[PDB]
From a paper:
The proline-rich antimicrobial designer peptide Api137 inhibits protein expression in bacteria by binding simultaneously to the ribosomal polypeptide exit tunnel and the release factor (RF), depleting the cellular RF pool and leading to ribosomal arrest at stop codons. Separation of cellular extracts derived from cells exposed to Api137 in a sucrose gradient reveals elevated levels of partially assembled and not fully matured precursors of the 50S subunit (pre-50S). High-resolution structures obtained by cryogenic electron microscopy demonstrate that a large proportion of pre-50S states are missing up to five proteins (uL22, bL32, uL29, bL23, and uL16) and have misfolded helices in 23S rRNA domain IV. These data suggest a second mechanism for Api137, wherein it disrupts 50S subunit assembly by inducing the formation of misfolded precursor particles potentially incapable of evolving into active ribosomes, suggesting a bactericidal mechanism.
These include states that correspond to the canonical route (states 10, 11, 12 and 14) plus two almost mature intermediates (states 13 and 15), mature 50S, and an intermediate with density for the assembly factor YjgA (state 9). As all proteins of the S10 operon, including S3 and uS17, except uL22, uL16, and uL29, were incorporated into all 50S, 30S, and precursor states, this strongly suggests that Api137 directly interferes with ribosomal assembly rather than attenuating the expression of some ribosomal proteins.
Numbering used by the authors:
A (entry chain C): 1 to 271
B (entry chain 2): 1 to 46
The structure:
Amino acid sequence: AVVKCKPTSPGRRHVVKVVNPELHKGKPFAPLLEKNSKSGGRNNNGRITTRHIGGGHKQAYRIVDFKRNKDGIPAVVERLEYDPNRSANIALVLYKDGERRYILAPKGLKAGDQIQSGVDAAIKPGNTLPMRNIPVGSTVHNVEMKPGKGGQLARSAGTYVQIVARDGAYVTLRLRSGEMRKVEADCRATLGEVGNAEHMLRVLGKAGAARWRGVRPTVRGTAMNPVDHPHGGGEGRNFGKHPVTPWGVQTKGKKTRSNKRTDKFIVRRRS
Amino acid sequence: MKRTFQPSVLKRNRSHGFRARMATKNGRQVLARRRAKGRARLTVSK
RNA sequence: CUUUAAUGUUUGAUGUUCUAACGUUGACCCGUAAUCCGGGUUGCGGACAGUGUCUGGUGGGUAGUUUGACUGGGGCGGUC
RNA sequence: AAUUCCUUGUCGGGUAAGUUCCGACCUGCACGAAUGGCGUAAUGAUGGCCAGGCUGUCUCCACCCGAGACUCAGUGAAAU
RNA sequence: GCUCGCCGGAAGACCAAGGGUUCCUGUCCAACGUUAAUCGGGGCAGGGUGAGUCGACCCCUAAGGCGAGGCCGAAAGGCGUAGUCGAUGGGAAACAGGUUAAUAUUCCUGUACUUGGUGUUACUGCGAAGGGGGGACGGAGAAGGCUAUGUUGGCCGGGCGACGGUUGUCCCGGUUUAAGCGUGUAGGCUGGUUUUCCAGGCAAAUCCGGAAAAUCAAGGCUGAGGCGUGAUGACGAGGCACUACGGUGCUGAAGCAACAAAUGCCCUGCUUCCAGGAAAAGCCUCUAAGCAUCAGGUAACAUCAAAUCGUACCCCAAACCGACACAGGUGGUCAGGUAGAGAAUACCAAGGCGCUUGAGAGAACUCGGGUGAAGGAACUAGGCAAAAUGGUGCCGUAACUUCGGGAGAAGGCACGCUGAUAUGUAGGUGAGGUCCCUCGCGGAUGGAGCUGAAAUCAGUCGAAGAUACCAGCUGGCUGCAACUGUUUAUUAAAAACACAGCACUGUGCAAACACGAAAGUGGACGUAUACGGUGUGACGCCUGCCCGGUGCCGGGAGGUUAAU
RNA sequence: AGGACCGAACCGACUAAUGUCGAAAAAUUAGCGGAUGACUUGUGGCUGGGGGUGAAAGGCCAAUCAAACCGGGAGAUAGCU
């Protein structure tokens, strides 16, 4: 659900919250928890590689099952939890053999629902099936690029990929970016669309939301000195230069895709 | 006013101790130069 | 010799297919109480990608430099 | 106009007196629409002006309370 | 020794970090103390630091370091696995009184507790770098039960007192007692007992998890405080006897009740919020390998050991960092009485100090203030500085507005003391007696007793009763910026930077991008509702024309075009 | 519930005055803004010089920063004093 807080004060005036009533109001499943130490944009060398990262509320990583190797084992959805690491919400799944795991929550899943992985699966949301078994023209999420990888496509909230064609051993998938990609049929995929489709409605209200979400202030090039940024300099907000990255690479409409390895799997580009 | 030097024996030993100096050859070269100069206090220690 | 034609030959540019080089930050087993690494099987690409020398283009991102002289406040204007 | 050389542009308000300020016109040297234009409640140790109380800021300074200044005893520098 | 003054949320007492004998005694003013000095944190000599229960040490570990093999790199070396370090964290145990000139939670007196070895006795399956539970956790907020603590009353010992009265509802001081042990309550959490089965817990499992049942409906875990013992013990006001006259020995009465009450415990609790809130070890349990007449474990008893290191002193300062015996800086703990909402402010208890130059005079002038005739900003770039309001309760509160705000708008009236309402009310707490009890730390009545606001009337003193400190000046027009916030430590705090939002662009995941000769990393153990770059900066109208020049994208007709 | 309001500790330095061979190599007095968060602080580490960090000022990097400090080239050169 989407709610707008009354403008009791600045900072609350523009706050729009995304409240999910059915989420579990309790501690997560400890056995599946793992520590997640923040990096603040640093690397092994210790220097800042990616900027605007640092701080934020502590969060513990959840071991989410992606490969879904429990083939032919029906399972029940115990409940839904909010995973800080992912933009969507995770679902606790208890299998008939007596073990609990975490999966990505599709749109149509709720508490007490039945799911099952493996080739012998139905077309109901939450089931896992290779594209060969999945009928053409269907929407799937958490698709694999290679067998056993785990799943890499359509993992955000409210995302999905459409199965378009079937080129024998290969299948054509249209992604949310308009990309037409070719993927081996042996790879696995999950039916249905990811839940929490209202992720865009949140506006974070104020600076503090982004500050404690893990994003630090961003400084524009015009405000920087010539020694640091290619932009900047001159009295009175003078630019007189084409847009460029801080490192001299011309941005604002320059393609950086130079691989020549996976292009054989690329049918069309964005438009 | 909190001046530049705020003593802390643990930090002193872990930053300029003999073990730290020998950890890297550069510190070993520093120790060799100190010995050649013949200073009574080779490094900082209790 | 100018002009042509089947056969066998040197072959190059391009296209399709295969794997035995190569890639695997895909899966399984071992060294191994091991997300490193190496080895064995398999799957997926595959003579592509990537690397080494030469070479055309871009390249103030970076590095070394220059920006003459006469010239009565300055530069401009003018002369060598 | 945070932009205007001429300029204190012209007109009305505010003071008796207003190169500042507000409102109206545009003769825009040299505003202008995401290096944003137009309004915007609330916010500001933000710029400017005005009005009420207040008072030593001032007309115009006067006295008093404490430490220096001054005298004595002991210690005793500096720039040049 | 007696007066006067200061701190007393500190200018008191403990520590952590940091110093290294500055701590006490004897002895001296050669040098130091911004003067003298017999004095000192100064010179010489002596003494002083006692730990199974404090901490370090030690088991484990976060960030992070090192890193056997391994990858890469001209060499050096860089990354990193297994492993090992790394407290700023998790793990076992003590309190009261007494003593030295200097040590005490270490020494002495009393009562306890914890971990292992050895031996005896009765049973039994033991057994892990392996599995499961626990350890194990955020922000904000309300109540309840308590306690440290403080007030009053009764009791005890003394006093009745130099300027009026004080045998009386009067004054002075005490009324303290720990850890541990047993009861286990207030409160919080959770449904238990038994049987059968399961490809799950990288092999197994009686252990965890899951699936079926029969039975009861209670059980189990945690849990402050209070109560008895600890304790017919220590301590205890005061008195008595000697004093190297500083001081030492003996004795020693009562040691209870009510109220208020914490930021401290129940509370790692309970209720909500999204920003979703460390890891491992100790601890309980299950089994693999191997042995089960063994070994090993359990329960009771006796004994041994718990080593080594710091223990002085300062620790908001004269001893630490500032070159100084420097108006500066320094983390945590306890932090009381009256007024006060308050850890503010005014005076004090405990406790600590008068800050290491003073003695005179009371010129101009300087520094910090007090007052002021009349005008009240006329001074000045500028209401700069100064002056002024300032608190509680009640009425009332404009334009605009995003309907929240503006607003504590602006602007008006009462605050002292005493008696009555009410020989202190409402309210809070709550004795004894009476009745029940699923019988004890149990439930009703009841108000004894204690505490106790706010309001009305009347009277009364003062020029002024928020009487001291504390404690917004107010309104309008207006440019900037949405706002909170951050910046040039050490002349610029702003219209500058940043901000939530918006738009373009790049990236298909061995992603783009950046650090790196390369490995490998952050991005991300994330993934097109995801991440990087660019420009503007909430919200409403929106964001008009131009592709010539320079970038970017696509094209290949035709000319040029290196290496070869 | 509030990157809410008034206001102690805590943080910072917006105004005035004193101090410039000062108590202090940016200090003291009264006002001053935040004071539940984009807050602050204790401890231990990581980011090392044409490099780090930087809510961005050419700011900070041990009282020194438009390129720190230490030793060497080095008795650099100086048509200059």
